[PDB]
Amino acid sequence: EPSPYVEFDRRQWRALRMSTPLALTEEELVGLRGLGEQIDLLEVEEVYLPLARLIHLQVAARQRLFAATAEFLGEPQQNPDRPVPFIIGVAGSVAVGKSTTARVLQALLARWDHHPRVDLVTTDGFLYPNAELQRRNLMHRKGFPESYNRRALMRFVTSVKSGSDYACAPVYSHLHYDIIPGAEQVVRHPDILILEGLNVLQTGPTLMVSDLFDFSLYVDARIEDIEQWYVSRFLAMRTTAFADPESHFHHYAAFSDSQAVVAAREIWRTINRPNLVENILPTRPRATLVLRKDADHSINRLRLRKL
Amino acid sequence: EPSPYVEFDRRQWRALRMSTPLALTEEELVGLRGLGEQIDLLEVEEVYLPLARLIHLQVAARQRLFAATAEFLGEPQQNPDRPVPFIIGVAGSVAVGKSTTARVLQALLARWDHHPRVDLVTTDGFLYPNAELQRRNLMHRKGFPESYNRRALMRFVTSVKSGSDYACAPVYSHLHYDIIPGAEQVVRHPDILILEGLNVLQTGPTLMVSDLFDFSLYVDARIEDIEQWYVSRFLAMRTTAFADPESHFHHYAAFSDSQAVVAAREIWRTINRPNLVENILPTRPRATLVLRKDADHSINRLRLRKL
Numbered sequence: 001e002p003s004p005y006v007e008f009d010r011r012q013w014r015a016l017r018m019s020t021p022l023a024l025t026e027e028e029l030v031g032l033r034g035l036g037e038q039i040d041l042l043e044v045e046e047v048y049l050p051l052a053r054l055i056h057l058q059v060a061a062r063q064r065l066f067a068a069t070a071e072f073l074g075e076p077q078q079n080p081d082r083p084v085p086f087i088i089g090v091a092g093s094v095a096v097g098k099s100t101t102a103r104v105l106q107a108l109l110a111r112w113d114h115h116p117r118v119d120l121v122t123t124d125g126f127l128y129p130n131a132e133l134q135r136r137n138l139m140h141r142k143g144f145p146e147s148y149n150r151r152a153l154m155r156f157v158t159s160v161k162s163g164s165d166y167a168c169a170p171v172y173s174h175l176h177y178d179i180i181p182g183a184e185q186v187v188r189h190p191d192i193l194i195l196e197g198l199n200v201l202q203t204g205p206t207l208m209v210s211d212l213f214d215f216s217l218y219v220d221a222r223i224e225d226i227e228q229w230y231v232s233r234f235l236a237m238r239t240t241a242f243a244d245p246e247s248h249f250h251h252y253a254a255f256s257d258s259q260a261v262v263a264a265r266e267i268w269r270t271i272n273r274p275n276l277v278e279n280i281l282p283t284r285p286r287a288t289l290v291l292r293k294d295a296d297h298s299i300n301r302l303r304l305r306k307l
Numbered sequence: 308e309p310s311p312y313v314e315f316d317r318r319q320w321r322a323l324r325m326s327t328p329l330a331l332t333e334e335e336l337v338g339l340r341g342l343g344e345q346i347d348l349l350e351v352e353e354v355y356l357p358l359a360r361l362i363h364l365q366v367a368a369r370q371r372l373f374a375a376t377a378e379f380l381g382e383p384q385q386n387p388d389r390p391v392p393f394i395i396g397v398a399g400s401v402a403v404g405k406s407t408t409a410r411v412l413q414a415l416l417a418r419w420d421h422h423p424r425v426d427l428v429t430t431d432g433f434l435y436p437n438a439e440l441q442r443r444n445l446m447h448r449k450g451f452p453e454s455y456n457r458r459a460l461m462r463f464v465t466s467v468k469s470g471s472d473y474a475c476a477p478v479y480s481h482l483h484y485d486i487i488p489g490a491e492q493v494v495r496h497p498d499i500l501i502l503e504g505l506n507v508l509q510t511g512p513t514l515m516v517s518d519l520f521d522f523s524l525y526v527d528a529r530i531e532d533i534e535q536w537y538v539s540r541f542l543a544m545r546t547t548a549f550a551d552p553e554s555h556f557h558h559y560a561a562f563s564d565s566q567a568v569v570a571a572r573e574i575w576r577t578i579n580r581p582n583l584v585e586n587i588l589p590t591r592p593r594a595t596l597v598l599r600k601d602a603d604h605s606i607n608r609l610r611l612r613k614l
């Protein structure tokens with residue numbers, strides 16, 4: 001029976017790469033790869049290149065849609081070379097790899113003919129300050145929809161896509177586990193804006209950023225695996241981030257593999273997992289493209305929305 | 308501050324009509340107008356013509372989007388003259404005029420160059436049978452999301468848009484207040500499919516028909532007015548539909564203006580109003596175009612989604 005989707009195995013997907021050129025060194029893929037991630041240039045070749053090709057085919061097509069409305073509205077023509085920014089959403093669970101997926105994607109798309117301004121904005125900075133979360137009894141729901149200033153987030157994307165000269169987003173510090181005072185990321189009329197976060201794909205009683213997306217990615221994996229990835233990465237961070245005396249979680253550095261595992265699982269059980277199940281996963285159905293990962297972080301399956 | 312929307316007054320909207328021809332007689336508008344509706348050829352000129360123009364501009368544009376994905380997928384070209392059907396959703400409250408709005412729209416779009424097959428499907432037929440509603444304790448929630456076989460509805464639209472040769476939908480009888488046994492509406496690869504219902508625009512934890520829409524209309528009016536329209540129409544039906552001895556509500560024909568008013572308001576209070584507030588109105592934010600009506604049924608304002 002008919003389906004809005006079309007699935008592929010990596011062999012199948014690899015072939016749609018067609019002629020697409022690989023413009024990234026292995027030293028560059030590294031500065032994009034997050035701790036624990038297994039992405040290599042091969043995967044970028046058989047998976048991210050076709051995806052970049054697809055996206056570019058749609059970037060031009062997606063604008064005929066706006067032009068039409070512009071033609072209808074009698075309005076003049078586009079603004080000869082400052083089009084409606086193509087907005088891309090990247091969603092997925094904590095520790096699934098989306099952050100890397102988002103960075104690799106921005107790199108590939110920026111290295112394109114004529115060289116388009118491709119900005120990447122994570123929703124981290126749209127989290128409420130710890131003081132504000134403390135006030136709303138939310139310090140233990142960081143990552144849940146309500147922990148974000150979803151209104152500010154919407155004003156931001158709406159602004160950039162509505163053709164603004166520049167827009168600002170706050171900045172979150174992963175070292176201090178909090179929003180950075182006075183800091184800001186400025187975005188100037190990009191050609192493509194990539195928005196990455198746990199729920200970007202959420203719908204609601206109001207127009208949300210998921211409604212402004214022209215294309216969307218959802219990095220997926222078996223829930224047991226992600227937990228394994230989360231915990232492993234947690235243990236792994238004892239000698240990297242947590243090692244730093246400035247880290248809000250420096251006390252974790254001294255944990256034993258054993259107590260660190262216990263600590264990691266508890267956080268996952270009480271926070272990240274509930275949010276994945278209750279909020280993130282239910283948005284997967286409408287992702288333009290879903291990247292399914294095997295326990296080894298390898299992307300070997302894909303589901304595309306043809307409808 | 309930027310907005311995804313752009314509003315118009317009828318004067319403003321009237322002008323976007325541009326050159327669009329009026330191909331409907333006043334005798335034809337009548338066979339489309341529902342009891343209580345005040346729509347006339349003037350309104351069709353200053354409101355429905357621009358709208359038809361807009362939609363046609365998008366019908367071609369919207370397909371460059373599919374072609375792109377087809378080009379990417381290596382797939383051959385479209386099927387030379389049986390394109391991806393353009394799906395249009397029309398939503399709104401009971402008694403707001405959408406049913407008429409939907410019929411007038413189908414008429415206008417069918418009377419177009421090359422003459423496209425424009426089918427209209429109301430979600431009435433996707434309601435569960437009274438026996439089935441009785442079983443789910445839903446006979447008093449007819450119109451609410453749960454009273455519809457939303458899965459069958461999705462299979463239907465998915466099927467038509469996925470390029471099916473033909474698809475079937477059940478048929479609802481307004482005379483018998485129930486689904487008609489063995490009846491079916493067959494839709495054959497339309498060029499445009501109009502889907503009209505109370506909630507068509509609903510989103511959820513799963514891919515829904517709102518997600519397959521290429522354009523959407525939401526007929527709006529002040530809630531107090533709609534109630535007035537509902538009640539008036541209810542009274543008015545004592546000498547038309549209810550007069551028929553076959554009517555499931557024939558007993559209403561004998562009501563006095565007074566007890567009929569009481570009866571009408573109760574139904575509105577307990578069913579239609581709650582559903583408008585809790586389910587329909589919350590979907591308005593994402594309608595491509597909203598037709599705002601003044602107490603006299605006159606459309607004098609419009610809100611278009613430019614984003």
Ligand SMILES: Nc1ncnc2c1ncn2[C@@H]1O[C@H](COP(=O)(O)OP(=O)(O)OP(=O)(O)O)[C@@H](O)[C@H]1O
Nearest residue numbers: 034035037093094095096097098099100174175241
């Ligand atoms: N305490 C931390 N210090 C630094 N980085 C952290 C910390 N916790 C999580 N991270 C994340 O590690 C990410 C890079 O790895 P990856 O790209 O695999 O992240 P992820 O899977 O999206 O996980 P997360 O949602 O925690 O970022 C950075 O984007 C950063 O947000």
Ligand SMILES: Nc1ncnc2c1ncn2[C@@H]1O[C@H](COP(=O)(O)OP(=O)(O)OP(=O)(O)O)[C@@H](O)[C@H]1O
Nearest residue numbers: 341342344400401402403404405406407481482548
């Ligand atoms: N008992 C009834 N008998 C016949 N038609 C009815 C009855 N109740 C409501 N209607 C509706 O009257 C509609 C035509 O008028 P209009 O186009 O104004 O309807 P509407 O505002 O959408 O109201 P409704 O949702 O009740 O159809 C028909 O589509 C039919 O569904």
Ligand code: NA
Nearest residue numbers: 119186187188
């Ligand atoms: Na910028």
Ligand code: NA
Nearest residue numbers: 426493494495
């Ligand atoms: Na047909």
